[PDB]
């Protein structure tokens, strides 16, 4: 419902069930960003890049991969986090540092990169706005239901989605 926000969701085989597991949320307009993150010593490469990306208070979106965390995956996983974050930025014609990346699911398992590489080549701006409901579903792992909420304030809209019902006591900053 908020103006300027579009959602891309698609299956990329992060699990083998044909379910939407790859999400791009993006603003068609410049956006100020606020974010907080895990301070885990095993913080995934996705997190580091997010921090860097929000350092200037400026970001327009986030790619999210579900059913693989891309954590404890070494230099390979670092490379893969960058490649994916960048290829999304590039495919939508945004600057790298305005695209975040987030990833959830199994620890210690490499991304299925060829499947993700093929999908990226097709990626472009969603026709039309909205689809948070789709994003809400595509981010799920061991959730039994999508989690979504909408508030109106002073003529603007705020939509939130969340996921995560195990490995859950956030201590984010």
């Amino acid at each position: 419902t908020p103006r300027g926000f579009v959602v891309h969701t698609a299956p990329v085989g992060l699990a083998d069930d044909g379910r939407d597991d790859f999400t791009v949320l993006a603003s068609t307009a410049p956006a100020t960003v606020s974010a907080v993150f895990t301070r885990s010593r095993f913080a995934g490469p996705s997190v580091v890049l997010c921090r860097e990306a929000v350092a200037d208070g400026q970001a327009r979106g986030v790619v999210v991969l579900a059913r693989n965390a891309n954590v404890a995956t070494g230099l390979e996983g670092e490379e893969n986090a960058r490649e994916v974050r960048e290829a999304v930025a590039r495919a939508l014609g945004l600057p790298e540092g305005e695209m975040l990346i987030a990833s959830t699911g199994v620890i210690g398992r490499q991304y299925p990169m060829e499947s993700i590489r093929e999908h990226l080549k097709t990626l472009e701006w969603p026709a039309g706005e909205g689809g948070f409901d789709r994003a809400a579903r595509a981010i799920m792992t061991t959730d039994t239901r999508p989690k979504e909420v909408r508030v109106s304030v002073g003529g603007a809209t705020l939509v939130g989605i969340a996921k995560g019902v195990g490995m859950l006591e956030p201590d984010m900053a």
Partner: protein, 213 residues
């Protein structure tokens, strides 16, 4: 792993936006625990593009808070295997941070989480859990009060098993609900904090045993 994203067409002062985002995060996503297992991946973001024009920072903050909380209670109700949301309300603490520390300890006690799961009004497990904050030497068991729902079960006023029996029985009733409140007052000062978690079920264990997640 927690992933949560917020999107608004609100225009906000960037510095106010960060401050208010943090305040709400601290009271919501950083106030929930299913299994104490802080992930390697927790991410929470707000994007505010300007398209709907200026909004009052206080009105927005309020709105973000309601949005965040509703999502947090969603997560707590949907905890892996859970049947019951647990809400721990701590008051009278030295400061808010101690109230949060005690709430977390209690809502993360496996014995508290299973008693609630069985509907067993084993409030002595909540006294234990509070007791584990053994570096907070200003918490005095003589001054602490414990309730489930609206039923104060500690301290014993008078005897004897009373009393505890009846009201034990009343705690058993409230426990039958899908949302359970544990109120705790430390009678130290004005520190207050509410945290959210859930019960511990065979379902949690089976999922996470069977089950590569």
């Amino acid at each position: 792993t927690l992933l949560t994203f917020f999107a608004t067409d609100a225009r906000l002062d960037p510095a106010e936006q960060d401050r208010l985002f943090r305040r709400v995060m601290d009271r919501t996503f950083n106030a929930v625990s299913i299994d104490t297992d802080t992930s390697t991946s927790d991410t929470a973001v707000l994007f505010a593009n300007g398209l709907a024009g200026e909004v009052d920072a206080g009105e927005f903050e309020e709105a973000l808070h309601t949005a965040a909380l509703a999502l947090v209670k969603d997560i707590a109700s949907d905890g892996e295997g859970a049947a019951k949301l647990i809400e721990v309300q701590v008051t009278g603490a030295r400061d808010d941070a101690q109230a949060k520390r005690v709430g977390k300890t209690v809502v993360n006690s496996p014995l508290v989480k299973t008693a609630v799961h069985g509907c067993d009004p084993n409030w002595g497990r909540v006294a234990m859990a509070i007791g584990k904050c053994s570096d907070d030497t200003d918490i005095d068991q003589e001054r602490v009060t414990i309730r489930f729902g609206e039923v104060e079960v500690y301290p014993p006023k008078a005897r004897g098993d009373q009393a505890d029996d009846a009201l034990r029985a009343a705690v058993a009733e409230h426990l039958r609900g899908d949302e359970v409140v544990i109120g705790i007052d430390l009678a130290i000062a004005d520190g207050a904090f509410t945290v959210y978690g859930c019960d511990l079920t065979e379902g949690y264990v089976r999922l996470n045993s069977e089950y590569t997640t």
